[PDB]
Nucleic acid binder design. Structure first.
Ligand code: MG
Ligand code: MG
Ligand code: MG
Ligand code: MG
Ligand code: MG
Ligand code: MG
Ligand code: MG
Ligand code: MG
Ligand code: MG
Ligand code: MG
Ligand code: MG
Ligand code: ZN
Lengths: 136, 177, 115, 60, 84
RNA sequence: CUCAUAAAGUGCGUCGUAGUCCGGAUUGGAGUCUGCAACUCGACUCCAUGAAGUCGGAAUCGCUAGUAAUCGUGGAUCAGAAUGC
RNA sequence: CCUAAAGAGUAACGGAGGAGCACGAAGGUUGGCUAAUCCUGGUCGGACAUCAGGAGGUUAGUGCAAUGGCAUAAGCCAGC
């Protein structure tokens, strides 16, 4: 379950998720899982997907996690009236736009990488796709 | 002064010979000689700082700075600007008379003297050294001292490297080992 | 005045000053005074300078101070390096000369330390 | 050099027991008698076995 | 210590074995139980397995270290410390 | 005949209250003797070093006269090896 | 200070911090100076006290929060 070790501020505004993402290229490895839809990713979703990838591939190749949940999300506890202060921090998300290379991997045959990405995409809440490193 | 005459008369052309320079003032000089004595127990007693300052005036022939703390440090219980040391700087004929004093009196009087370390240079040609008992110095007498005390000596020169500085000091026959 | 880098007492007698010299005791001070041809009851305050120079020459025919100190240090270091039984006793900080260790041995073993 | 704060300072003769005299500008006033100078220190001049002791001890 | 006029001590068998080691080269560590004899310039740079009460601790006799005893090279009391 | 010149004492000089010309532990080097052999593990001599110790808490012991206290000497054991007897 | 949408202003039981003083010098002027941090060398001195040299270029400092400032210094020192 990913989380920043310390932050400048405990709570953060809601913000918007407009625009299209950068980091749209496979950078370190060769085979990448890239987002097509738009939404948030819980650190639990990241952890579940990473576990599915690593235990589908059975520890060959190497896995890069190109996203980090830096944004704290508050939730007001139940049976509480509106107002009286912003709610307590509950979990952390990463805002993901279309075209964000989510996961990346190397050292693995193509069909195995495609299968592992299929399990990862089944764990993800957003549209994803398979991409391949291009020399430019 | 006679050490300066020795310098200007032989040491410059000797340096010329083994280093093949282009300038008689490529031949290095001694930029300054400063004498420090850290009397950090002044926070325990400021008066022993005054006694130590008198002793350093006695060796230097010169009134010393009572230097204070640059920044407050927890471990030694000092506050910023607290007088914890004494210092003089020596230039010119005072270089030469005090260096004559050192090289012709003090280093023969070091208890269990085996020569000085040639690795005491700081990487930029400047030499430094530490004296443990100022009583090896005849500028202070035996039975009028209050506490055993030491000091440290730095000779800062215009030499560009350690081999330059050690060649200059060997020209002054400084006892390397 | 000054002998071998250390300053003897002046208000005292010659044998006591030469015992205050490290490396010289009573009989060696007898040897020094006999070689110098100086009466013992002569005091340091009334010793002349040439007499002191002869004393320096005679202890320099002898050996004192850091020479003997480093000689003892090299000896103990040699024993402890080659690791003989005396080396292991010096190594452990115990009596080296076969004294008992049931009890006593306190000067070698330091001050008493309870559990 | 200021005036009237530095310790009092004149020329002094010093004599080392090796027959040496030198000419030193200092503050103690009185002349100096010296044990050893740079002309007679053992380090400065340069004047500063088990099998052999065994053979000399128990030579056969 | 021995008298100067009585000379050093070596056992007869120890002398014999160290000499045949000398003209027949360095074999296995030289087995002995003689903790008692002293060392000479003859076994310089040689390994001797000395009895100490149960086993034969090997000691490598060198030049710098001649004159002492194999028995005091070989400790007999195994002591590791109290409360350990 | 040897062990075996007893010491404390006495006479003089020095030390002049200091961790000292007290103390003599420890440690280094150099030896002597016994004994086959002294390292584990002897005694003694010389040289060098000079530690704690400045009279000791609760408590506790010996002693009524040639006694306590102090100063030496001899013997048994034993090749050598007493502050013990 | 942010929310506050590049003039100003702009709410919430929105998100974070402070004040209810201090100083006759910590004010006026004149004159001078430049920091943090790290490395090497050096007696007690050690990771860190004082000194020398080098790198560095304000990452220091500002009587006290944060923002905006500041080398012509508004930062440091002394005279009147
Ligand atoms: Mg003695
Ligand atoms: Mg015993
Ligand atoms: Mg004491
Ligand atoms: Mg007393
Ligand atoms: Mg008795
Ligand atoms: Mg007997
Ligand atoms: Mg605005
Ligand atoms: Mg606007
Ligand atoms: Mg409005
Ligand atoms: Mg100005
Ligand atoms: Mg101002
Ligand atoms: Zn001389």
């Amino acid at each position: 379950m990913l989380q920043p070790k310390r932050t400048k501020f405990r709570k953060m505004h809601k913000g918007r998720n407009r625009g299209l993402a950068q980091g749209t290229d496979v950078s370190f490895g060769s085979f990448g899982l890239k987002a097509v839809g738009r939404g948030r990713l819980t650190a639990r979703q990241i952890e579940a997907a990473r576990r599915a990838m690593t235990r589908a591939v059975k520890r060959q190749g190497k896995i890069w996690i190109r996203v980090f949940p830096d944004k704290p999300i508050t939730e007001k506890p139940l049976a509480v009236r509106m107002g009286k202060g912003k709610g307590n921090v509950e979990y952390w998300v990463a805002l993901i736009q279309p075209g964000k290379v989510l996961y990346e991997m190397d050292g693995v045959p193509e069909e195995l990488a495609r299968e592992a990405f299929k399990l990862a995409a089944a764990k993800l809440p957003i549209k994803t796709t398979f991409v391949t490193k291009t020399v430019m | 002064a006679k050490l300066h005459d020795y310098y200007k008369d032989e040491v410059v052309k000797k340096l010329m010979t083994e280093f093949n320079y282009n300038s008689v003032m490529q031949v290095p000089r001694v930029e300054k000689i400063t004498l420090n004595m850290g009397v950090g127990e002044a926070i325990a007693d400021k008066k022993l700082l005054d006694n130590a300052a008198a002793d350093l005036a006695a060796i230097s022939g010169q009134k010393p700075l009572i230097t204070k703390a640059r920044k407050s440090v927890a471990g030694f219980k000092i506050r910023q600007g607290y007088p914890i040391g004494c210092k003089v700087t020596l230039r010119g004929e005072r270089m030469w008379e005090f260096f004559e004093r050192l090289i012709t009196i003090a280093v023969p009087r070091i208890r269990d003297f085996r020569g000085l370390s040639a690795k005491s240079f700081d990487g930029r040609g400047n030499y430094s050294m530490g004296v443990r008992e100022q009583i090896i110095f005849p500028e202070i007498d035996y039975d009028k001292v209050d506490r055993v005390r030491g000091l440290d000596i730095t000779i800062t020169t215009t030499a560009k490297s350690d081999e330059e500085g050690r060649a200059l000091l060997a020209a002054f026959d400084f006892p390397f080992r | 005045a000054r002998i071998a880098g250390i300053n003897i007492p002046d208000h005292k007698h010659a044998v006591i000053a030469l015992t205050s010299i490290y490396g010289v005791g009573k009989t060696r001070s007898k040897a020094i005074l006999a070689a110098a041809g100086i009466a013992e009851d002569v005091k340091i305050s009334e010793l002349s300078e040439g007499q002191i120079d002869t004393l320096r020459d005679e202890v320099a025919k002898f050996v004192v101070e850091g020479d003997l100190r480093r000689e003892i240090s090299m000896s103990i270091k040699r024993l402890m390096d080659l690791g003989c039984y005396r080396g292991l006793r010096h190594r452990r900080g115990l009596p080296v000369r076969g004294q008992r260790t049931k009890t006593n041995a306190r000067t070698r073993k330091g001050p008493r330390k309870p559990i | 050099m200021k005036k009237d704060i530095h310790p009092k300072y004149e020329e002094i003769t010093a004599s080392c027991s090796c027959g040496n005299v030198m000419k030193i500008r200092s503050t103690v006033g009185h002349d100096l008698n010296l044990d050893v100078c740079s002309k007679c220190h053992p380090f400065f001049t340069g004047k500063q076995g088990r099998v052999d002791r065994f053979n000399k001890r128990f030579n056969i | 210590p021995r008298s100067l006029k009585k000379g050093p001590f070596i056992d007869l068998h120890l002398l014999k074995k160290v000499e045949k080691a000398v003209e027949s080269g360095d074999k296995k560590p030289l087995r002995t139980w003689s903790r008692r004899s002293t060392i000479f310039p003859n076994m310089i740079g040689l390994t001797i397995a000395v009895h100490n009460g149960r086993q034969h601790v090997p000691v490598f006799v060198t030049d710098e270290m001649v004159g002492h005893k194999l028995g005091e090279f070989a400790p007999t009391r195994t002591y590791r410390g109290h409360a350990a």
